[model samples]
Target chain A: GDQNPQIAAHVISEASSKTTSVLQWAEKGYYTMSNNLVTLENGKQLTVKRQGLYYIYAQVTFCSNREASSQAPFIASLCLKSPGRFERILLRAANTHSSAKPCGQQSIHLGGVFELQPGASVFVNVTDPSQVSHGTGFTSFGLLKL
Target chain B: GDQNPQIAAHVISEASSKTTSVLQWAEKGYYTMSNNLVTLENGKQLTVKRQGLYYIYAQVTFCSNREASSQAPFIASLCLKSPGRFERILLRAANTHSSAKPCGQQSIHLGGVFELQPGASVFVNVTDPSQVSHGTGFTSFGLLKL
Candidate 1:
């Protein structure tokens, strides 16, 4: 049989926090999936292929306890982890907000080709303000190889 | 009995491309969704209780057929809408990658407080493209009011 494989993929979201309430709440909330790979079954072993790029997206409204400095930088990092003890991939650092006049929407695009070798896993995490000062929301997805 | 009011939100993604196939493909592939609300047996809407400030976030990926200028700009729009009309809440133009650079990931983040009346919706659209390109991926989510 020729090894021309068919691909199918799905997106999954995971949230981890030191606070119990945050974890429990996230478990029940809805999240989005992006760039997913199509999975194929080869006998007992399963293979996954790239479909496209993936992202973790979220919209949150946070109230400042006090007037915070607009110059303060809010940073976020996107990371990926494979199934085995493979080298972890850091997608990029994104600013939550910018200093342009009135506060406007901030958009960050990660530029790079992240080809997952088979049987790999990906994840995203925010490093700055590690704690939720007021409220935070987010969702993520990955490209699939079909 | 406590009644939680569920807020209806909408999300939209639109992209304008100069290239025929790329633009056509991006227009066909882009997607949008509204916030999900669950109702209890007692007729109570499930909503995030704690309200303060939150951030609204969205990410879209653009890929080009021919690698162009690193200064190439790709524009996308985000709106909050409901009922008969919509309001332009956020507008963004993502930066293009360097021609020498390989194709990969690009993402945008829009964060702000939700001051809209309960039951209001959020929508995002990519109205223009500064360069010839295609939109390959779109994903959105928000937090706050929890």
Candidate 2:
């Protein structure tokens, strides 16, 4: 079936866009899962179907469409939503910058071992939505049971 | 014992610095392990003490001590030396960026499973050593048998 949610999936973004909340994709995206552990929601959040020790992770690639400059900044984050509307953020990323040079790119990623409960959700965000790149596994979000 | 460079132990990096080879830290930085499973080699490499699957991980933080014109670029990577002199890169991240104005910082982490062998070494590298902070587990490198 088309547009089916998954249990546990590892997927990367398919395009670059400015999303206010969680990141979104235009395509089904690239991913693998274990019995649909989660569902894709609102273009960026992953709602869980099961609960356990899940090793969650995310990666982001910031590309500069403009000309060169000093070190450009980039940030990637992993977010969580749980019982009682509790929201937590897993901060990730590149905080370094520069001297005379052309506008370029940077990469950053993060993951941690955490216990999850049923109905919990996970998501990814970028400091600058427009900076994150798509394709070649540039921007991604996912998790696996530990 | 006050001294334990006693060999037969596995380890990885000290202070942060830009390195193209691999990231090496000062002994006893920000990681912990029950037993030694690898060795520290060169300035930025981890030689395997035993062969097996490893739950390897790394973390890097980008801090801005000055005014921000835009998003700065930073990179953190974990690499491995396998059955041969040839090398393979593993655990890489902080691949994103953003726009101008203000001062701030960021963080990123990543890891995964890998089959390591005797004589094989694991190491990490970053784009800007100056950006990688050192304290309270802000930046670290480590792994263990899975």
The candidates' DockQ values read 0.03, 0.16
TM-score of chain B of each: 0.45, 0.72
Candidate 1 per-residue lDDT over residues A41-139, each given as its tens digit: 221112344422222222222221112424343333333444566545333333323223243334333322233444644433343332333233333
lDDT of 1 at A109: 36
Number of clashes in every candidate structure?
A: 58, 41
Q: Point out where model 2 deviates above 4 Å.
A: A1-7, A14-21, A26-29, A65-72, A97-100, B1-52, B62-146
The C-alpha lDDT values of all candidates are: 0.34, 0.59
| Interface RMSD (Å) of candidate 1 | 13.2
Encode model 2's per-residue lDDT on B27-145: one tens digit a residue.
46312333354555554665667777777777767565443423455567788777666877786775443444233456766677888887667777776665555544345565555
The candidate that wins on lDDT is 2
